[PDB]
Amino acid sequence: VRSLNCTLRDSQQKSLVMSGPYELKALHLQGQDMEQQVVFSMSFVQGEESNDKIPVALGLKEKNLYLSCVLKDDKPTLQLESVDPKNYPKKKMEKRFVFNKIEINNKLEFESAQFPNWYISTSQAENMPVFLGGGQDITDFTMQFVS
Ligand SMILES: O=C(NCCO)Nc1ccc(Br)cn1
């Protein structure tokens, strides 16, 4: 499987950092604090594809942790999920790990492949969790490539 290391920033230009072991949060960051941002390994996985819709998995660089979409208290919910480090990443990722990376107006949205029309989202407020949203909440991102 092919993977690229990258960071993400929301359309309000908030960066993403760890919020405990299994959550991410978004906040405005600049300067030395930039080292705190999460670096993703974006893997290009199997799934239905178009020019503007590309299936990816979002793992944390050098960690056996992936973003995943599951029902929690009966609601679609973004979680960080651990995996066996000997088996990942792989080309045929389970559907809960797959996001459709969609380019619209020079920004990216990440739609859950498991839950159509649910998107990786951030709040306008500082220091709040990254979540799966189904308006005020931000669903557009840019990507920064990392060496
Ligand atoms: O401009 C970007 N990065 C800033 C320099 O690090 N990224 C970018 C641009 C278009 C789309 Br679509 C997604 N990401």
Swiss-Prot record:
Expressed in activated monocytes/macrophages (at protein level). The record marks 53, 61, 63, 72, 86 as: Important for interaction with integrin. GO terms for biological process: apoptotic process; astrocyte activation; cell-cell signaling; cellular response to interleukin-17; cellular response to lipopolysaccharide; cellular response to mechanical stimulus; cellular response to xenobiotic stimulus; cytokine-mediated signaling pathway. Activation of the IL1B precursor involves a CASP1-catalyzed proteolytic cleavage. Processing and secretion are temporarily associated. (Microbial infection) Cleavage by S.pyogenes cysteine protease SpeB promotes its activation independently of CASP1. GO terms for cellular component: cytosol; extracellular region; extracellular space; lysosome; secretory granule. (Microbial infection) Cleavage by S.pyogenes cysteine protease SpeB promotes its activation independently of CASP1. SpeB-mediated maturation of IL1B plays a dual role depending on infection site: while IL1B inflammatory response prevents bacterial growth during invasive skin infections, it promotes streptococcal infection of the nasopharynx by disrupting colonization resistance mediated by the microbiota. GO terms for molecular function: cytokine activity; integrin binding; interleukin-1 receptor binding; protein domain specific binding. It is found in: Cytoplasm, Cytosol; Secreted; Lysosome; Secreted, Extracellular exosome. Induction: By LPS. Transcription and translation induced by M.tuberculosis and a number of different M.tuberculosis components in macrophages; EsxA is the most potent activator tested (at protein level). In pancreatic islets, release is increased by high glucose treatment. In pancreatic islets and macrophages, release is also increased by endocannabinoid anandamide/AEA. The record marks 2 as: Involved in receptor binding. It comes from the Eukaryota. Potent pro-inflammatory cytokine. Initially discovered as the major endogenous pyrogen, induces prostaglandin synthesis, neutrophil influx and activation, T-cell activation and cytokine production, B-cell activation and antibody production, and fibroblast proliferation and collagen production. Promotes Th17 differentiation of T-cells. Synergizes with IL12/interleukin-12 to induce IFNG synthesis from T-helper 1 (Th1) cells. Plays a role in angiogenesis by inducing VEGF production synergistically with TNF and IL6. Belongs to the IL-1 family. This is Interleukin-1 beta. It comes from Homo sapiens. The chain holds residues 119 to 268 of 269 of the full protein.
